[PDB]
Amino acid sequence: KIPRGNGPYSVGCTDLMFDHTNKGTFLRLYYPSQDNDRLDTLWIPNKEYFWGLSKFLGTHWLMGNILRLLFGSMTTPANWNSPLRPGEKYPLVVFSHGLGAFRTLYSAIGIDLASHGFIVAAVEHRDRSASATYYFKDQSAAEIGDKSWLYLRTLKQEEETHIRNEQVRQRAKECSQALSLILDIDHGKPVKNALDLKFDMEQLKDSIDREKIAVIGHSFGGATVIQTLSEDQRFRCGIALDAWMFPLGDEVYSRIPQPLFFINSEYFQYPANIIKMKKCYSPDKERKMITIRGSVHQNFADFTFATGKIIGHMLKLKGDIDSNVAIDLSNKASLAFLQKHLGLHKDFDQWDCLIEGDDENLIPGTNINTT
Ligand SMILES: Cc1ccccc1-c1cc(C(=O)c2nccs2)ccc1C
Ligand SMILES: [Cl-]
Ligand SMILES: [Cl-]
């Protein structure tokens, strides 16, 4: 089980694709919901995501079929297509997934943020960093639901620097484009969802606290946070969850005026990566860094709740720390950070001490020595 949100709001979930092309926005929306008696949300909704997952893990696509057998009916505790909770303007998080992931795989984060009164737009990237994604070749294909699938691209050694940087820049553009889509919907601009789903986008009219915008992401998505902030000032702060810094250009590091929070796992980080995080620091800039004790890279993803403790530890989906304990720390410290830098009038400041790494299961800053 993916945990339910800890906040007071019920959580809805829907998908939005606009336009229908490989250049349009595809996102999964998590939102405060009016109702709590809908069907739970299908975690991985299409067989082709399992094929892409199997390719990314370096197995035969038939292991994809076995993963589908084991996980294809798994749900996440968000009310599918629930009406939006009316009568409040919600701050907006745009969320960026890791390499091999896609929009649906950070629901523990998305649901928790929504349960505290956020709208969350979890982007599906079309940079070939997702294990799979889909779109429609044209308007006829969209109408009949004839999906075109795009699978993870594997790189040769000498494509690494260049293609990862091309990908992070496309990812930033996709985050900006998703923001603009949501902001235009918030006006009441008619948008016809390329997916035929029983959620009226007209509900989102006048629902966004238009100045309270953040970008959050894991791993590749953590780099995407930083790229996005340097190029789109509409984002007011960023949270990089165990950022993989390698994709970022040399130019970005001095170009991030917004507050930035690094939440790291203990066992992923390494000096080359920490050195790159430290390049984002300047005395005029607001920077914070914490490390979750006993955690691994995938503690931020829903894969951490998908198996038992032994299989979990074996597959590096779980660390020595309990997965619920770890995600609570990351989500609560995130809430306090967003309250501070978005200027929210909630009670998230109760977790301010977590921003400083002041907890038995937190390391202030980093465990990694860079000398
Ligand atoms: C746990 C799980 C459930 C359903 C499909 C795939 C997985 C899986 C996932 C990873 C993983 O670490 C990642 N996959 C994509 C991005 S990270 C490693 C092993 C397994 C079995
Ligand atoms: Cl290193
Ligand atoms: Cl790790």
Side-chain angles (χ1 to χ4, degrees), residues 197-212:
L197 293 179
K198 289 172 209 128
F199 182 95
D200 183 11
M201 292 293 160
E202 290 174 6
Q203 287 178 93
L204 295 164
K205 185 178 185 281
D206 303 321
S207 79
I208 302 293
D209 209 318
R210 295 183 54 99
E211 297 239 316
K212 305 207 191 298

Side-chain angles (χ1 to χ4, degrees), residues 252-266:
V252 293
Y253 290 100
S254 73
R255 303 176 178 189
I256 309 139
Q258 305 96 316
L260 172 61
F261 188 19
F262 296 96
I263 308 179
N264 294 345
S265 74
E266 193 174 344

Side-chain angles (χ1 to χ4, degrees), residues 107-163:
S107 76
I109 300 173
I111 286 163
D112 189 72
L113 281 164
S115 78
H116 288 91
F118 286 83
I119 289 162
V120 180
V123 179
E124 190 153 295
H125 293 294
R126 269 69 165 271
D127 65 334
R128 305 200 59 204
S129 76
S131 49
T133 191
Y134 67 96
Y135 54 87
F136 307 95
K137 292 278 173 74
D138 55 20
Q139 187 44 46
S140 291
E143 272 152 40
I144 62 156
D146 172 39
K147 292 185 196 73
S148 291
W149 286 90
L150 186 64
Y151 291 106
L152 183 114
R153 186 185 173 170
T154 72
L155 315 184
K156 308 155 178 178
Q157 199 179 327
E158 78 303 312
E159 266 177 328
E160 288 167 338
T161 298
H162 172 67
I163 299 301

Side-chain angles (χ1 to χ4, degrees), residues 221-241:
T224 305
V225 166
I226 294 164
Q227 186 68 41
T228 298
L229 290 177
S230 72
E231 60 175 78
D232 187 346
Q233 291 308 297
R234 294 173 311 174
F235 296 92
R236 308 298 205 88
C237 71
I239 305 169
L241 299 178

Side-chain angles (χ1 to χ4, degrees), residues 12 28 35 101 109 117 128 156 182-183 185 193 200 208 210 218 232 256 262 330 337 342 351 354:
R28 176 154 285 193
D35 299 302
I109 300 173
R128 305 200 59 204
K156 308 155 178 178
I182 302 151
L183 290 175
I185 297 175
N193 197 346
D200 183 11
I208 302 293
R210 295 183 54 99
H218 175 236
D232 187 346
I256 309 139
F262 296 96
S330 185
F337 192 80
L342 302 168
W351 303 298
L354 304 187

Side-chain angles (χ1 to χ4, degrees), residues 265 267-268 295-298 316:
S265 74
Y267 300 133
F268 175 75
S295 65
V296 305
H297 198 49
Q298 293 311 319
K316 311 256 266 160

